[PDB]
Amino acid sequence: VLPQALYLSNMRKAVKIRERTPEDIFKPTNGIIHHFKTMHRYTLEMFRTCQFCPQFREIIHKALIDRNIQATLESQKKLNWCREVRKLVALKTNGDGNCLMHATSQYMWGVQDTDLVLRKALFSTLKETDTRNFKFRWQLESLKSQDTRNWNDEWDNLIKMASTDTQYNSLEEIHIFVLCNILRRPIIVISDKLKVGGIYLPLHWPAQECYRYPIVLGYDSHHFVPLVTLKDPEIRAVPLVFEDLKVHFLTDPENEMKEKLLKEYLMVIEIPVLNNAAKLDEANLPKEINLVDDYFELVQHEYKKWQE
Amino acid sequence: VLPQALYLSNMRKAVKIRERTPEDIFKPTNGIIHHFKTMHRYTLEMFRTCQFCPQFREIIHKALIDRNIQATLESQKKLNWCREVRKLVALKTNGDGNCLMHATSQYMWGVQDTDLVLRKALFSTLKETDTRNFKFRWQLESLKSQNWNDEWDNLIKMASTDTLQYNSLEEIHIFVLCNILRRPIIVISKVGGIYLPLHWPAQECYRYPIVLGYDSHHFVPLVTLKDSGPEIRAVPLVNRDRGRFEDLKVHFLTDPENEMKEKLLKEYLMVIEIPVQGWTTHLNNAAKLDEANLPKEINLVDDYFELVQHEYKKWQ
């Protein structure tokens, strides 16, 4: 009776959001990579669920939440281990090949990448802008895990993966890095083990020009989901650890000033029981494009009915 | 890609509509039947579809329109026989037992009767208000087709929400329903005919009909399209009907009212005469249909149209 995604609660509003998305991308003519002007600053938070009686709480969770990935990551102590920070919750995402974009898109705007705007922005970037430095950073991280001109063809293959051909090719770590530079906003992927886990910082941008709240994605079994906060004393933050999270595609200069880069690109605070954490953004989506308030109203209406 | 009901285009808005529905029912203290204060005046029209290329037009029709009933009624010359009046179109409706209410509800507001507000209003009426006159009118129409007290108590039990999740509803329930809506209903298809809200003076009623289609135990709304003209916005009150032009049945009249039948039609509907093909060839009557008057805050059609516009750009 409740729908299986936030956006289905007001498909007209979701269309409005998805129409605004491509007009907000700025394409420089001088080789600077294309990027969002405004909409990268938006962040979604789930509504509170604890005021509903446990049985009907369960009906909401089954509808919206990806309980498989939520359990895998909680059990392994990657997700919601720290009692002093807010609970994060995994929303369902389509496994059609474009889940990285569906996940990232949901995190910011509450809609998936159904019109392939994020996916095509990735591809367009990699085909039309200077990728010399991305290729370099990629080659350097690849060599760390291990003499020939076979490097050039893997790179051209990674560009072809970004396209919309065959329903779509999956996307690996370098695409996430490129994507955070399109969004001028860092991405943190929490996972098992699956080298995808870690922090992607928009290093082709000075920190002052970037949004200093991360996009938090969960990842398991080739599947990305957004890990959003709930609106309810605990601090709004994601732990960056005790062993540090991997910070991806650094050069060796940047790798030496790693902690300072984190401080520049995220807002780092120290948490009690000393380990660091990044501040998370508050829900700032205006009503005109806030799908969560619409879904909450379906829930409120269905709850009155549920009760006697 | 496109959803299978108008309401799925903005479920939040449909919830708003369905929350407003029960608060608009007024329950008199003096025995008058309970009735809608405002929302019975609303009428829904489909958006134009002919500007889309035929293949993509077909995707919209398959999504929204009940093509089985549309074809059955057109083929038999009951629906859209008259070239001078606007085309009517059958929207899909659930066959869960409460289709009369789903159909009527869709016609006015673009949502089905998922919360059983119309269904419960019917039942509540028949259990709690004086039904002496409804029973009389029923007995009289029943005898014309041929233990009375037990059939009547059975018809009240049919109106409830018990024990095909719900019991089906027959002609008397449609009559009682138009008196709750203070608005007449026309069913095109013995269920076929005109139900007038005769427990109300015409001055207190909405004089545009609700037009439903009916075939194989199934009710659907027959809504108009938003068009350019020149054709008149109206529904014919006669059949083409094999040989000869023949008036629609007007239901549950007493014999006084049955003698002033034409004047009752003029009181409760807005009757106009249409130019008849041939012109001694001469005018048969039709009832004016309402224009789309649902304000934006509760207009699901404008929302569905915007999904279509967006999906059409992509289609191309």
Coordinates of N, CA and C in Angstrom, one line a residue, chain B residues 78-228:
Chain B
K78 N -24.2 2.9 -28.2 CA -24.7 3.6 -27.0 C -23.8 4.8 -26.7
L79 N -22.5 4.7 -27.0 CA -21.5 5.7 -26.7 C -20.9 6.3 -27.9
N80 N -20.8 7.6 -28.0 CA -20.2 8.4 -29.1 C -20.7 8.0 -30.5
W81 N -22.0 7.8 -30.5 CA -22.7 7.7 -31.8 C -23.0 9.1 -32.4
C82 N -23.3 10.1 -31.6 CA -23.7 11.4 -32.0 C -22.5 12.2 -32.4
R83 N -22.5 12.6 -33.7 CA -21.4 13.4 -34.2 C -21.3 14.9 -33.8
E84 N -22.5 15.4 -33.3 CA -22.6 16.8 -32.9 C -22.1 17.0 -31.4
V85 N -21.9 16.0 -30.6 CA -21.5 16.1 -29.2 C -20.1 15.6 -29.0
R86 N -19.4 16.2 -28.0 CA -18.0 15.8 -27.6 C -17.9 14.3 -27.4
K87 N -16.6 13.8 -27.6 CA -16.3 12.4 -27.3 C -16.2 12.2 -25.8
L88 N -16.7 11.1 -25.4 CA -16.5 10.6 -24.0 C -15.6 9.5 -23.9
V89 N -14.8 9.3 -22.8 CA -13.8 8.4 -22.7 C -13.8 7.7 -21.4
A90 N -13.7 6.3 -21.4 CA -13.8 5.5 -20.2 C -12.4 5.4 -19.5
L91 N -12.3 5.8 -18.3 CA -11.1 5.6 -17.5 C -11.2 4.3 -16.7
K92 N -10.0 3.6 -16.5 CA -10.0 2.4 -15.8 C -10.4 2.5 -14.3
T93 N -11.0 1.5 -13.8 CA -11.6 1.5 -12.5 C -11.3 0.1 -11.9
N94 N -11.2 0.0 -10.5 CA -11.0 -1.3 -9.9 C -12.3 -2.1 -9.8
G95 N -12.2 -3.4 -10.1 CA -13.3 -4.4 -9.9 C -13.2 -5.1 -8.6
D96 N -13.0 -4.4 -7.5 CA -12.9 -5.0 -6.2 C -14.3 -5.1 -5.4
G97 N -15.4 -4.9 -6.1 CA -16.8 -4.9 -5.5 C -17.4 -3.5 -5.4
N98 N -16.5 -2.4 -5.2 CA -16.9 -1.1 -5.0 C -16.8 -0.2 -6.2
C99 N -16.9 -0.7 -7.4 CA -16.6 0.0 -8.6 C -17.6 1.1 -8.9
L100 N -18.9 1.0 -8.5 CA -19.8 2.1 -8.6 C -19.2 3.3 -7.9
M101 N -18.7 3.1 -6.7 CA -18.1 4.3 -6.0 C -16.8 4.7 -6.6
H102 N -16.0 3.8 -7.0 CA -14.7 4.1 -7.6 C -14.9 5.0 -8.9
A103 N -15.9 4.5 -9.7 CA -16.3 5.2 -10.9 C -16.8 6.6 -10.7
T104 N -17.8 6.7 -9.8 CA -18.4 8.0 -9.4 C -17.4 8.9 -8.8
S105 N -16.5 8.4 -8.0 CA -15.4 9.1 -7.3 C -14.4 9.7 -8.3
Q106 N -14.0 8.8 -9.2 CA -13.1 9.2 -10.3 C -13.7 10.3 -11.1
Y107 N -15.0 10.2 -11.5 CA -15.6 11.2 -12.3 C -15.5 12.6 -11.7
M108 N -15.8 12.7 -10.4 CA -15.7 14.0 -9.8 C -14.3 14.5 -9.4
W109 N -13.5 13.6 -8.8 CA -12.2 14.0 -8.2 C -10.9 13.4 -8.7
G110 N -11.0 12.4 -9.6 CA -9.8 11.7 -10.1 C -9.2 10.7 -9.2
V111 N -9.8 10.4 -8.1 CA -9.4 9.3 -7.2 C -10.5 8.3 -7.1
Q112 N -10.1 7.1 -6.7 CA -11.1 6.0 -6.4 C -11.5 6.2 -5.0
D113 N -12.4 5.3 -4.6 CA -13.0 5.3 -3.2 C -12.3 4.3 -2.4
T114 N -10.9 4.5 -2.3 CA -10.0 3.6 -1.6 C -10.3 3.5 -0.1
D115 N -10.7 4.7 0.5 CA -11.0 4.8 1.9 C -12.5 4.6 2.2
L116 N -13.3 4.1 1.2 CA -14.7 3.7 1.4 C -15.6 4.8 2.0
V117 N -15.2 6.1 1.7 CA -16.0 7.2 2.2 C -17.4 7.2 1.5
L118 N -17.4 7.1 0.2 CA -18.7 7.1 -0.5 C -19.5 5.8 -0.2
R119 N -18.8 4.6 -0.2 CA -19.5 3.4 0.2 C -20.1 3.4 1.6
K120 N -19.3 3.9 2.6 CA -19.8 4.0 4.0 C -20.9 5.1 4.1
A121 N -20.8 6.2 3.3 CA -21.9 7.1 3.3 C -23.3 6.5 2.9
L122 N -23.2 5.7 1.8 CA -24.4 5.0 1.3 C -24.9 4.1 2.4
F123 N -24.1 3.2 3.0 CA -24.5 2.3 4.0 C -25.1 3.0 5.2
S124 N -24.4 4.0 5.7 CA -24.8 4.8 6.8 C -26.2 5.5 6.6
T125 N -26.4 6.0 5.5 CA -27.7 6.5 5.0 C -28.8 5.5 5.2
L126 N -28.6 4.4 4.5 CA -29.6 3.3 4.5 C -29.9 2.6 5.9
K127 N -28.9 2.6 6.8 CA -29.1 2.1 8.2 C -29.7 3.1 9.1
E128 N -29.3 4.4 9.0 CA -29.6 5.5 10.0 C -30.7 6.5 9.6
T129 N -31.0 6.7 8.3 CA -32.0 7.6 7.9 C -33.3 6.9 7.5
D130 N -34.4 7.6 7.4 CA -35.7 7.1 7.0 C -35.6 6.6 5.6
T131 N -35.8 5.3 5.4 CA -35.8 4.8 4.0 C -37.2 4.5 3.5
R132 N -38.2 4.8 4.2 CA -39.6 4.5 3.8 C -39.8 4.8 2.3
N133 N -39.5 6.0 1.9 CA -39.7 6.5 0.6 C -38.9 5.8 -0.5
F134 N -37.6 5.4 -0.1 CA -36.7 4.7 -1.0 C -37.3 3.3 -1.2
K135 N -37.8 2.6 -0.2 CA -38.3 1.3 -0.3 C -39.6 1.3 -1.2
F136 N -40.4 2.3 -1.0 CA -41.6 2.4 -1.8 C -41.2 2.5 -3.3
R137 N -40.3 3.5 -3.6 CA -39.9 3.7 -5.0 C -39.3 2.5 -5.6
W138 N -38.5 1.8 -4.8 CA -37.9 0.5 -5.2 C -38.9 -0.6 -5.6
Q139 N -39.9 -0.8 -4.7 CA -41.0 -1.8 -4.9 C -41.7 -1.5 -6.1
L140 N -42.0 -0.3 -6.4 CA -42.8 0.2 -7.6 C -42.0 -0.1 -8.9
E141 N -40.7 0.2 -8.9 CA -39.9 -0.1 -10.1 C -39.7 -1.7 -10.3
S142 N -39.6 -2.4 -9.2 CA -39.4 -3.9 -9.2 C -40.7 -4.6 -9.8
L143 N -41.8 -4.1 -9.3 CA -43.1 -4.7 -9.8 C -43.2 -4.5 -11.3
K144 N -42.8 -3.3 -11.8 CA -42.9 -3.0 -13.3 C -42.2 -4.0 -14.2
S145 N -41.1 -4.6 -13.7 CA -40.3 -5.6 -14.4 C -40.9 -7.0 -14.4
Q146 N -41.9 -7.3 -13.6 CA -42.4 -8.7 -13.3 C -43.7 -8.9 -14.0
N147 N -40.7 -12.2 -1.0 CA -41.2 -11.4 0.0 C -40.4 -10.0 0.1
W148 N -41.2 -8.9 -0.1 CA -40.6 -7.6 -0.3 C -39.7 -7.1 0.8
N149 N -40.1 -7.3 2.0 CA -39.4 -6.8 3.2 C -37.9 -7.3 3.3
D150 N -37.7 -8.6 3.0 CA -36.4 -9.3 3.1 C -35.4 -9.0 2.0
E151 N -36.0 -8.8 0.8 CA -35.1 -8.3 -0.3 C -34.6 -6.9 0.0
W152 N -35.4 -6.1 0.6 CA -35.0 -4.7 1.0 C -33.9 -4.7 2.1
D153 N -34.1 -5.5 3.1 CA -33.1 -5.7 4.2 C -31.8 -6.2 3.6
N154 N -31.9 -7.1 2.6 CA -30.7 -7.6 1.9 C -30.0 -6.5 1.1
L155 N -30.8 -5.6 0.5 CA -30.2 -4.5 -0.3 C -29.4 -3.5 0.7
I156 N -29.9 -3.4 1.9 CA -29.2 -2.6 2.9 C -27.9 -3.3 3.3
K157 N -27.9 -4.6 3.5 CA -26.7 -5.4 3.8 C -25.7 -5.4 2.7
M158 N -26.1 -5.4 1.4 CA -25.2 -5.2 0.3 C -24.4 -3.9 0.3
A159 N -25.0 -2.8 0.8 CA -24.3 -1.5 0.9 C -23.2 -1.5 1.9
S160 N -23.1 -2.4 2.8 CA -22.1 -2.5 3.8 C -20.8 -2.9 3.3
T161 N -19.7 -2.9 4.1 CA -18.4 -3.3 3.8 C -18.0 -4.6 4.5
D162 N -18.7 -5.7 4.0 CA -18.5 -7.0 4.5 C -18.2 -8.0 3.4
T163 N -17.8 -9.2 3.8 CA -17.7 -10.4 2.9 C -17.4 -10.2 1.4
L164 N -13.4 -9.6 -5.5 CA -14.7 -9.5 -4.8 C -14.5 -9.5 -3.3
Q165 N -13.9 -8.4 -2.8 CA -13.8 -8.0 -1.4 C -15.1 -7.3 -0.9
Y166 N -16.0 -6.8 -1.7 CA -17.2 -6.2 -1.3 C -18.4 -6.7 -2.1
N167 N -19.6 -6.6 -1.6 CA -20.8 -6.9 -2.3 C -21.0 -5.9 -3.5
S168 N -21.5 -6.4 -4.6 CA -21.9 -5.6 -5.7 C -23.1 -4.8 -5.4
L169 N -23.3 -3.6 -6.1 CA -24.4 -2.7 -5.8 C -25.3 -2.5 -7.1
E170 N -26.6 -2.6 -6.9 CA -27.6 -2.5 -7.9 C -28.3 -1.2 -8.0
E171 N -29.3 -1.0 -8.8 CA -29.9 0.3 -9.2 C -30.3 1.2 -8.1
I172 N -30.9 0.7 -7.1 CA -31.4 1.5 -5.9 C -30.3 2.2 -5.2
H173 N -29.1 1.6 -5.1 CA -28.0 2.2 -4.5 C -27.5 3.4 -5.3
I174 N -27.6 3.3 -6.6 CA -27.2 4.4 -7.5 C -28.2 5.6 -7.2
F175 N -29.4 5.2 -7.1 CA -30.4 6.3 -6.8 C -30.1 7.0 -5.4
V176 N -29.9 6.2 -4.4 CA -29.6 6.7 -3.1 C -28.3 7.6 -3.1
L177 N -27.4 7.1 -3.9 CA -26.1 7.8 -4.1 C -26.2 9.2 -4.7
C178 N -27.1 9.3 -5.7 CA -27.3 10.7 -6.3 C -27.9 11.7 -5.3
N179 N -28.8 11.1 -4.4 CA -29.3 12.0 -3.4 C -28.3 12.4 -2.3
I180 N -27.3 11.5 -2.1 CA -26.2 11.9 -1.2 C -25.3 13.0 -1.9
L181 N -25.1 12.9 -3.2 CA -24.4 13.9 -4.0 C -25.2 15.1 -4.5
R182 N -26.5 15.1 -4.3 CA -27.3 16.1 -4.9 C -27.0 16.4 -6.3
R183 N -26.8 15.4 -7.1 CA -26.3 15.5 -8.4 C -26.7 14.3 -9.2
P184 N -27.3 14.4 -10.4 CA -27.8 13.3 -11.1 C -26.8 12.4 -11.8
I185 N -27.1 11.1 -12.0 CA -26.2 10.2 -12.6 C -26.8 9.6 -13.8
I186 N -26.0 9.4 -14.9 CA -26.5 8.8 -16.1 C -25.6 7.6 -16.3
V187 N -26.2 6.4 -16.5 CA -25.4 5.2 -16.7 C -25.7 4.8 -18.1
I188 N -24.7 4.6 -19.0 CA -24.9 4.2 -20.3 C -24.5 2.8 -20.4
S189 N -25.4 1.9 -20.9 CA -25.1 0.5 -21.1 C -26.0 -0.2 -22.2
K190 N -30.7 -3.4 -17.3 CA -31.7 -2.5 -16.7 C -31.1 -1.4 -15.9
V191 N -29.8 -1.5 -15.5 CA -29.1 -0.4 -14.8 C -28.9 0.9 -15.6
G192 N -28.9 0.8 -16.9 CA -28.8 1.9 -17.8 C -30.0 2.9 -17.5
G193 N -29.7 4.2 -17.6 CA -30.7 5.3 -17.4 C -30.2 6.5 -16.6
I194 N -31.2 7.2 -16.1 CA -31.0 8.5 -15.4 C -31.5 8.4 -14.0
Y195 N -30.6 8.7 -13.1 CA -31.0 8.8 -11.7 C -31.0 10.3 -11.3
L196 N -32.1 10.8 -10.8 CA -32.3 12.2 -10.4 C -32.4 12.2 -8.9
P197 N -31.8 13.3 -8.3 CA -31.9 13.4 -6.8 C -33.3 14.0 -6.3
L198 N -34.3 13.2 -6.4 CA -35.7 13.6 -6.2 C -36.0 13.9 -4.8
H199 N -35.2 13.6 -3.8 CA -35.5 14.0 -2.4 C -34.9 15.4 -2.1
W200 N -34.4 16.0 -3.1 CA -34.0 17.4 -3.1 C -34.8 18.2 -4.1
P201 N -35.1 19.4 -3.8 CA -35.5 20.3 -4.8 C -34.4 20.6 -5.8
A202 N -34.7 20.7 -7.1 CA -33.7 20.9 -8.1 C -32.8 22.1 -7.9
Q203 N -33.4 23.2 -7.3 CA -32.6 24.4 -7.0 C -31.4 24.2 -6.1
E204 N -31.5 23.1 -5.2 CA -30.4 22.8 -4.3 C -29.4 21.7 -4.8
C205 N -29.6 21.4 -6.1 CA -28.8 20.3 -6.7 C -27.8 20.9 -7.7
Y206 N -26.8 20.1 -8.1 CA -25.9 20.4 -9.2 C -26.5 19.9 -10.5
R207 N -26.7 20.7 -11.5 CA -27.4 20.4 -12.7 C -26.6 19.9 -13.8
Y208 N -25.4 19.3 -13.5 CA -24.6 18.6 -14.5 C -24.5 17.2 -14.1
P209 N -24.6 16.2 -15.0 CA -24.7 14.8 -14.6 C -23.3 14.2 -14.3
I210 N -23.3 13.1 -13.6 CA -22.1 12.2 -13.6 C -22.5 11.2 -14.6
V211 N -21.5 10.9 -15.5 CA -21.8 10.0 -16.6 C -20.9 8.8 -16.3
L212 N -21.5 7.6 -16.2 CA -20.8 6.4 -16.0 C -21.2 5.5 -17.1
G213 N -20.2 4.6 -17.5 CA -20.5 3.5 -18.4 C -20.6 2.3 -17.6
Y214 N -21.3 1.3 -18.2 CA -21.5 0.0 -17.5 C -21.6 -1.2 -18.5
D215 N -20.8 -2.2 -18.2 CA -20.8 -3.5 -19.0 C -20.2 -4.6 -18.1
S216 N -20.8 -5.8 -18.2 CA -20.3 -7.0 -17.5 C -20.0 -6.7 -16.1
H217 N -21.0 -6.2 -15.4 CA -20.9 -6.1 -13.9 C -19.8 -5.0 -13.5
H218 N -19.5 -4.1 -14.4 CA -18.4 -3.2 -14.2 C -18.8 -1.7 -14.6
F219 N -18.5 -0.8 -13.6 CA -18.8 0.6 -13.8 C -17.5 1.3 -14.1
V220 N -17.5 2.3 -15.0 CA -16.4 3.2 -15.3 C -17.0 4.6 -15.4
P221 N -16.1 5.6 -15.2 CA -16.5 7.0 -15.5 C -16.3 7.3 -17.0
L222 N -17.2 8.0 -17.6 CA -17.1 8.4 -19.0 C -16.9 9.9 -19.0
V223 N -15.7 10.3 -19.0 CA -15.3 11.7 -18.9 C -15.1 12.3 -20.3
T224 N -15.2 13.7 -20.3 CA -15.0 14.4 -21.6 C -13.5 14.8 -21.7
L225 N -13.1 15.1 -22.9 CA -11.7 15.6 -23.2 C -11.7 17.1 -23.4
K226 N -10.6 17.7 -23.0 CA -10.4 19.2 -23.1 C -10.0 19.6 -24.6
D227 N -11.0 20.1 -25.3 CA -10.9 20.3 -26.7 C -11.1 21.7 -27.3
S228 N -11.1 21.8 -28.6 CA -11.2 23.1 -29.2 C -12.6 23.4 -29.7

